[PDB]
Amino acid sequence: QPSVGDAFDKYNEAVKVFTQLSSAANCDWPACLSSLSASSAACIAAIGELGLDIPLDLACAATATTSATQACKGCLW
Amino acid sequence: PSVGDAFDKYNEAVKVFTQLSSAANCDWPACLSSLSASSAACIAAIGELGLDIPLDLACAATATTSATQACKGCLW
């Protein structure tokens, strides 16, 4: 089988790349998260950390039907 | 789109991992409990019975090690 360890490494690398690029951008995570139309555990956790947890921000954003909100400019698109 | 492309690759890594986990005999709830990690991602992932793959991965990334038998097929 394809290595699940490698796939986990690639997940961690994708989070790192996003974290490096997102830190350099004009992202307001609490505003972005609140703008999302997302009812999910990931969003409860992400909003609960005031957007400070980038992995939870990403998991939350993936559960929303809308990602291209004005408040999420600089964060997700 | 700098962050937009990076978010797309994040989603691809999660989607690939999701399909790969089903084929690898992974017991996510057992794996999560074996990590003994009480980070926010882990509490949320455990409450979701391991069904939320993005939170499973975020939880695993907060653990000190993935070296448990319950995480064979999930993380190694």
Numbering used by the authors:
A (entry chain B): 2 to 78
B (entry chain A): 3 to 78
From the paper:
The most abundant virulence factor secreted by Hc yeast cells is Calcium Binding Protein 1 (Cbp1), which is absolutely required for macrophage lysis. The mature secreted form of Cbp1 is 78 amino acids in length, has no known domains, and, prior to this work, had only one known homolog in the closely related fungus Paracoccidioides. The Cbp1 structures displayed an alpha-helical dimer arrangement with an intermolecular four-helix bundle fold at the core formed from the 3rd and 4th helices of each monomer, creating a binocular shape, and thus we dubbed this new arrangement as a “binocular” fold. For both Pb03 and H88 Cbp1, the three disulfide bonds present in each monomer orient the alpha helices so that the aromatic residues (Phe12, Phe19, Trp30) are packed in the interior of the protein, creating the hydrophobic core.
Crystals of Hc H88 and Pb03 Cbp1 homologs formed after a week and diffracted to 1.6 Å. The diffraction data from Hc H88 was resolved by molecular replacement using the Pb03 model. Using this model in the Phaser program in the Phenix crystallography programming suite, we obtained a TFZ score of 8.4 and an LLG score of 63.271, supporting the validity of the molecular replacement solution. The asymmetric unit for the Pb03 Cbp1 crystal contained a single dimer, whereas the asymmetric unit for the H88 crystal contained a dimer of dimers. An alignment of the two dimers of H88 Cbp1 structure gave a root mean squared deviation (RMSD) value of 0.755 Å, indicating the structure remains largely unchanged amongst the dimers. An alignment of the Pb03 and the Hc CBP1 dimers gave an RMSD of 1.6 Å, indicating the structures of the distinct homologs are conserved. The H88 structure was not as clearly polarized but did display a groove of strong negative charge on its C-terminal side. The bottom of the C-terminal helices that form the core four-helix bundle of the Pb03 Cbp1 are much more negative relative to the Hc H88 Cbp1 homolog. When the new structures were aligned against the G186AR NMR structure, the resulting RMSD value was 5.6 Å and 5.8 Å for Pb03 and H88 Cbp1, respectively, consistent with the NMR structure not being found by DALI and VAST searches of the crystal structures. Notably, when we modeled these residues on the Pb03 or H88 crystal structure, we found that the residues that were required for Cbp1 protein secretion were all facing inwards away from the protein surface, suggesting they are important for proper folding.
